[PDB]
Design an enzyme around this catalytic site. Sequence first.
Site, PDB file in Angstrom:
ATOM      1  N   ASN A  76      -2.847  -4.570  13.742  1.00 12.54           N
ATOM      2  CA  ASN A  76      -4.302  -4.403  13.790  1.00 12.54           C
ATOM      3  C   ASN A  76      -4.960  -5.288  14.840  1.00 12.54           C
ATOM      4  O   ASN A  76      -6.098  -5.739  14.674  1.00 12.54           O
ATOM      5  CB  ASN A  76      -4.920  -4.604  12.404  1.00 12.54           C
ATOM      6  CG  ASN A  76      -4.591  -3.456  11.459  1.00 12.54           C
ATOM      7  OD1 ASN A  76      -4.497  -2.294  11.883  1.00 12.54           O
ATOM      8  ND2 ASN A  76      -4.415  -3.764  10.175  1.00 12.54           N
ATOM      9  N   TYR A  97       3.528   6.408   2.647  1.00 17.21           N
ATOM     10  CA  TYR A  97       2.112   6.748   2.402  1.00 17.21           C
ATOM     11  C   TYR A  97       1.797   8.186   1.914  1.00 17.21           C
ATOM     12  O   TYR A  97       0.637   8.623   1.899  1.00 17.21           O
ATOM     13  CB  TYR A  97       1.324   6.534   3.688  1.00 17.21           C
ATOM     14  CG  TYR A  97       0.944   5.114   4.048  1.00 17.21           C
ATOM     15  CD1 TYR A  97       1.371   4.012   3.322  1.00 17.21           C
ATOM     16  CD2 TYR A  97       0.095   4.892   5.121  1.00 17.21           C
ATOM     17  CE1 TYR A  97       0.989   2.731   3.681  1.00 17.21           C
ATOM     18  CE2 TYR A  97      -0.300   3.626   5.480  1.00 17.21           C
ATOM     19  CZ  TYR A  97       0.151   2.547   4.754  1.00 17.21           C
ATOM     20  OH  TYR A  97      -0.242   1.280   5.110  1.00 17.21           O
ATOM     21  N   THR A 135       0.830  -1.206   0.000  1.00 13.28           N
ATOM     22  CA  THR A 135       0.000   0.000   0.000  1.00 13.28           C
ATOM     23  C   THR A 135       0.855   1.242   0.000  1.00 13.28           C
ATOM     24  O   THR A 135       1.741   1.383   0.844  1.00 13.28           O
ATOM     25  CB  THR A 135      -0.933  -0.023   1.236  1.00 13.28           C
ATOM     26  OG1 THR A 135      -1.921  -1.031   1.024  1.00 13.28           O
ATOM     27  CG2 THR A 135      -1.613   1.305   1.486  1.00 13.28           C
ATOM     28  N   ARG A 184      -2.986 -15.076   1.232  1.00 19.07           N
ATOM     29  CA  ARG A 184      -1.998 -14.562   2.181  1.00 19.07           C
ATOM     30  C   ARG A 184      -2.454 -14.701   3.627  1.00 19.07           C
ATOM     31  O   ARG A 184      -3.579 -14.342   3.979  1.00 19.07           O
ATOM     32  CB  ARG A 184      -1.649 -13.099   1.886  1.00 19.07           C
ATOM     33  CG  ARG A 184      -0.346 -12.664   2.557  1.00 19.07           C
ATOM     34  CD  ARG A 184       0.163 -11.302   2.130  1.00 19.07           C
ATOM     35  NE  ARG A 184       1.616 -11.248   2.280  1.00 19.07           N
ATOM     36  CZ  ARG A 184       2.333 -10.180   2.607  1.00 19.07           C
ATOM     37  NH1 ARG A 184       1.756  -9.022   2.943  1.00 19.07           N
ATOM     38  NH2 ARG A 184       3.656 -10.288   2.646  1.00 19.07           N
ATOM     39  N   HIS A 213      -6.292 -11.463   0.482  1.00 18.52           N
ATOM     40  CA  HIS A 213      -5.642 -11.025   1.713  1.00 18.52           C
ATOM     41  C   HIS A 213      -6.420 -11.556   2.917  1.00 18.52           C
ATOM     42  O   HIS A 213      -7.547 -11.128   3.167  1.00 18.52           O
ATOM     43  CB  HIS A 213      -5.608  -9.494   1.760  1.00 18.52           C
ATOM     44  CG  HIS A 213      -4.704  -8.916   2.809  1.00 18.52           C
ATOM     45  ND1 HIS A 213      -3.860  -9.676   3.584  1.00 18.52           N
ATOM     46  CD2 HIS A 213      -4.449  -7.627   3.143  1.00 18.52           C
ATOM     47  CE1 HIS A 213      -3.161  -8.889   4.382  1.00 18.52           C
ATOM     48  NE2 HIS A 213      -3.499  -7.643   4.136  1.00 18.52           N
ATOM     49  N   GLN A 268      -3.898  -7.954  -5.214  1.00 21.79           N
ATOM     50  CA  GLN A 268      -4.326  -8.319  -3.871  1.00 21.79           C
ATOM     51  C   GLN A 268      -5.683  -7.689  -3.594  1.00 21.79           C
ATOM     52  O   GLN A 268      -5.862  -6.478  -3.792  1.00 21.79           O
ATOM     53  CB  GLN A 268      -3.345  -7.900  -2.790  1.00 21.79           C
ATOM     54  CG  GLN A 268      -3.804  -8.412  -1.437  1.00 21.79           C
ATOM     55  CD  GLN A 268      -2.999  -7.928  -0.268  1.00 21.79           C
ATOM     56  OE1 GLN A 268      -2.983  -6.742   0.049  1.00 21.79           O
ATOM     57  NE2 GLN A 268      -2.360  -8.870   0.429  1.00 21.79           N
ATOM     58  N   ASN A 309      -2.691  -9.797   8.293  1.00 24.34           N
ATOM     59  CA  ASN A 309      -2.425  -8.445   8.774  1.00 24.34           C
ATOM     60  C   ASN A 309      -3.574  -7.755   9.482  1.00 24.34           C
ATOM     61  O   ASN A 309      -3.597  -6.532   9.596  1.00 24.34           O
ATOM     62  CB  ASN A 309      -1.880  -7.576   7.639  1.00 24.34           C
ATOM     63  CG  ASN A 309      -0.560  -8.092   7.089  1.00 24.34           C
ATOM     64  OD1 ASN A 309       0.186  -8.768   7.772  1.00 24.34           O
ATOM     65  ND2 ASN A 309      -0.286  -7.790   5.839  1.00 24.34           N
ATOM     66  N   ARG A 317       9.755  -3.592   1.937  1.00 15.44           N
ATOM     67  CA  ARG A 317      10.273  -2.250   2.107  1.00 15.44           C
ATOM     68  C   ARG A 317      11.461  -1.957   1.212  1.00 15.44           C
ATOM     69  O   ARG A 317      11.605  -0.838   0.737  1.00 15.44           O
ATOM     70  CB  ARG A 317      10.606  -1.991   3.568  1.00 15.44           C
ATOM     71  CG  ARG A 317       9.333  -1.798   4.403  1.00 15.44           C
ATOM     72  CD  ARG A 317       9.611  -1.886   5.894  1.00 15.44           C
ATOM     73  NE  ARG A 317       9.740  -3.281   6.320  1.00 15.44           N
ATOM     74  CZ  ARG A 317       9.933  -3.650   7.580  1.00 15.44           C
ATOM     75  NH1 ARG A 317      10.036  -2.737   8.549  1.00 15.44           N
ATOM     76  NH2 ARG A 317      10.027  -4.932   7.879  1.00 15.44           N
ATOM     77  N   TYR A 337      -6.808  -7.531   8.767  1.00 21.12           N
ATOM     78  CA  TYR A 337      -7.968  -7.016   8.023  1.00 21.12           C
ATOM     79  C   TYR A 337      -9.163  -7.984   8.163  1.00 21.12           C
ATOM     80  O   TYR A 337      -9.117  -8.879   8.998  1.00 21.12           O
ATOM     81  CB  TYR A 337      -7.558  -6.626   6.578  1.00 21.12           C
ATOM     82  CG  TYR A 337      -6.487  -5.562   6.692  1.00 21.12           C
ATOM     83  CD1 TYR A 337      -6.828  -4.245   6.903  1.00 21.12           C
ATOM     84  CD2 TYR A 337      -5.134  -5.903   6.754  1.00 21.12           C
ATOM     85  CE1 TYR A 337      -5.876  -3.273   7.080  1.00 21.12           C
ATOM     86  CE2 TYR A 337      -4.167  -4.934   6.948  1.00 21.12           C
ATOM     87  CZ  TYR A 337      -4.549  -3.612   7.118  1.00 21.12           C
ATOM     88  OH  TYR A 337      -3.578  -2.640   7.305  1.00 21.12           O
TER      89      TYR A 337
END
Lengths: 399, 399
Positions: free
Chosen positions: B251, B375, B37, B243, B191, B114, B194, B348, B196
């Site tokens: 989160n 971001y 993202t 994933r 996804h 994704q 993480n 990254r 979500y």
Amino acid sequence: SFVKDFKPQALGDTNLFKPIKIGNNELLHRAVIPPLTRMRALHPGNIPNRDWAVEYYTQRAQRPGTMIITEGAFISPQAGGYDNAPGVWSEEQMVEWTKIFNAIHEKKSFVWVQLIVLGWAAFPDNLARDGLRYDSASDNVFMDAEQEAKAKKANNPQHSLTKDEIKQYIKEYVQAAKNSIAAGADGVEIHSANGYLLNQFLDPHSNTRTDEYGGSIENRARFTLEVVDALVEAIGHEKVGLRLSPYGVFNSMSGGAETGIVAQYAYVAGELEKRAKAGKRLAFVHLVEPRVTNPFLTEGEGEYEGGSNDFVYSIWKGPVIRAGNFALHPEVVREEVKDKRTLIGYGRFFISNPDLVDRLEKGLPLNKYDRDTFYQMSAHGYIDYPTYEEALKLGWDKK
Amino acid sequence: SFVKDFKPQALGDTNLFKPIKIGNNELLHRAVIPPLTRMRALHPGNIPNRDWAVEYYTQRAQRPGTMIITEGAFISPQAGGYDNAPGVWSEEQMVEWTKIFNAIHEKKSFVWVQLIVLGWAAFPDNLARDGLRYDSASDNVFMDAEQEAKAKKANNPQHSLTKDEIKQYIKEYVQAAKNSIAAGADGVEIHSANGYLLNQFLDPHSNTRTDEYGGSIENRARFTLEVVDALVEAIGHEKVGLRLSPYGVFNSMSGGAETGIVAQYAYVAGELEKRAKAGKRLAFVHLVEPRVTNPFLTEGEGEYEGGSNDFVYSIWKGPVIRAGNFALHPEVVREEVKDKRTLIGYGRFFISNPDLVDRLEKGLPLNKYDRDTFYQMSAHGYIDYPTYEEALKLGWDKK
Ligand SMILES: Cc1cc2nc3c(=O)[nH]c(=O)nc-3n(C[C@H](O)[C@H](O)[C@H](O)COP(=O)(O)O)c2cc1C
Ligand SMILES: Cc1cc2nc3c(=O)[nH]c(=O)nc-3n(C[C@H](O)[C@H](O)[C@H](O)COP(=O)(O)O)c2cc1C
Ligand SMILES: C=C(C)[C@H]1CC=C(C)C(=O)C1
Ligand SMILES: C=C(C)[C@H]1CC=C(C)C(=O)C1
Ligand SMILES: [Cl-]
Ligand SMILES: [Cl-]
Ligand SMILES: [Cl-]
Ligand SMILES: [Cl-]
Ligand SMILES: [Cl-]
Ligand SMILES: [Cl-]
Ligand SMILES: [Mg+2]
Ligand SMILES: [Mg+2]
Ligand code: NA
Ligand code: NA
Ligand code: NA
Ligand code: NA
Ligand code: NA
Ligand code: NA
Ligand code: NA
Ligand code: NA
């Protein structure tokens, strides 16, 4: 004779020879005797062998600080079905067990009674004779053709346990555990491995129940965890271990072919760790390795390479005993014991080497085992395997 | 500048540089771009950035045969809640995505979209503005204090999804997948990591439902597996990956502190392998490593040492992509890729090195990343990171 094509390695410089506390016991090394059925118990009454069993265990307790898990012992007549395996329900049995425990303790070693319930592995004809049921989790799948044949002939149908009958087994586990401790044992191991009754509940091939004891991971694990909880309450978490064989196929278990098998065992391990964080950590989890998916196949056979037990270590944070083809593979043991909470069970080579621990420390040749006397009603192949000193005197180094 | 305290190692002599087939794509190496993202999508309409996104992906597709997983894309307005992340529900979105896919393909690389649904990670105030719900598995546990504050202010309460609303999300996943493929994508990644929405269902902290979507391992996995099945049917198993982040805490997921967490993920993996044996093997499983339990902590922080993802390999027998702090650890990658079905996601450092694959092959210095522009609404820190050639011309070797 000694094993011919084996290059021993001294393991005295590894954690196999570092002390560790298991339950109440200060082990002086991490070579454990796993449970080994020998079929010398006497009929009637499933009585530990009055002539030889003390000597057998004494011999194998000879290295101070050794943890010994007994041969599996039936918790009740209904739990049995082999005439020459011992029980722990009667006074006459416990009198003999007490002598065995005393002897092991005189050698400054330790003893844990493995508690067994056979389920579909039992002989239906022996059970019919004694007016007993032939039990399993379900009644629509059967162990194998020989068992089927025996059941037809004995007119004793495989029976799917009722919830009340499961509760009766749990009562029997509790009393058997109490009997074991009262007679002098250091602890008990709950057998939930190798395709016996608790494993028959864990495994979706053998468990097709639609009540709360089957049809999901949580439900298939219910009986095993109920026994764990009952024994923890009865005699203390520090006196209880659990044996599992996630990849085993012995007695018609699924092993790795079942894609849900890791999840099933991971759930059990997680539930044990939950109890451990909640103040009741079992003394140990004992795992049979995928190195040996059937212990009656020669070392190197029946290896499953598609799975590892290492997952258990991500979940359960207590001691782990691992068993399966380690005697002939000191190079593997050397790596595994680098983990500081890992112990190694040596089965078949403890049958044949009463002084196995000395031999592991010093890298000595190993006595070959004689599979023909694993289950024989004899002192031969039970109490007459020599120590290394005795073997040299017998000329075994030149055989 | 280049990363200062890093000793690169050339990885061209490892399986990282051996071709592998993933779904329909012949990858030429196993360095994958995981979903990242970047928040350059434009408001209103969640439109992929019309100025810079093609260039960004083109740059990172430059090594032929690279697998790129896109930044997460919302399947619908209700699934979103960040104004500057893209969607894949509208014509105006797909027009831009098609240009991106075409550009990646012109570089002879591959692209997997994704698909994301935010659940409790969404901004309740953005959602309220657009007349949308603030959704999660349950309504009695909330992500964190900032989210609580935002929800109170927006007067938009966390809402426990009804079964009908779960079905509506599934319909949206299906249409989003179809849109992605029709626009030119090679596949999609579901996804379920993480923290979500799908992860909120997998995790017993965030999922306290008592219907068929919670309260057990099977039930908590139901939504994820329903999406898997719906997309396999819609566009083919070879065009679908999944994933997972078993040990993640981002989160407000449980990670290793939940003793049942391995069982939960082992179950999902087992259900994928069951489908694979039944003729529908997903293209890949993508795992976030316990090396990185929160991707907004600097490399080396938030490491969980109490668990491994290796269990997945005992269960799932297809390709596995692993991501988390691998760029700075070529010595770890060298060992992991010895497994012939393992690929490595670099997140990254792919942000900051458009030619990362060349740098991995040849053991070149890596450009430092700038977290301040991860971001940002800017070309700076998005499309102006230099290749190694450009960095030398800029004098970065003496910075
Ligand atoms: C003769 C024999 C008897 C056994 N009896 C038992 C038993 O009573 N309970 C049990 O859990 N395992 C039993 N096992 C399995 C062993 O404990 C052990 O896991 C297995 O033999 C593999 O280890 P090894 O390669 O060191 O022999 C038995 C194995 C053998 C060969
Ligand atoms: C800026 C940023 C954006 C990310 N966006 C996503 C995303 O859209 N979807 C996702 O599954 N993971 C996302 N992640 C997690 C990454 O895919 C990856 O797993 C993580 O950064 C760890 O890998 P690394 O150490 O190589 O960066 C993101 C991570 C970062 C730092
Ligand atoms: C009769 C029993 C007590 C043992 C028989 C053989 C094995 C491998 C067991 O696990 C149990
Ligand atoms: C907004 C999203 C699509 C991504 C945000 C950051 C991470 C780690 C994700 O997994 C999803
Ligand atoms: Cl030999
Ligand atoms: Cl018999
Ligand atoms: Cl007691
Ligand atoms: Cl630096
Ligand atoms: Cl926003
Ligand atoms: Cl299609
Ligand atoms: Mg003979
Ligand atoms: Mg700056
Ligand atoms: Na002999
Ligand atoms: Na040696
Ligand atoms: Na005698
Ligand atoms: Na026999
Ligand atoms: Na700069
Ligand atoms: Na190098
Ligand atoms: Na511009
Ligand atoms: Na932010």
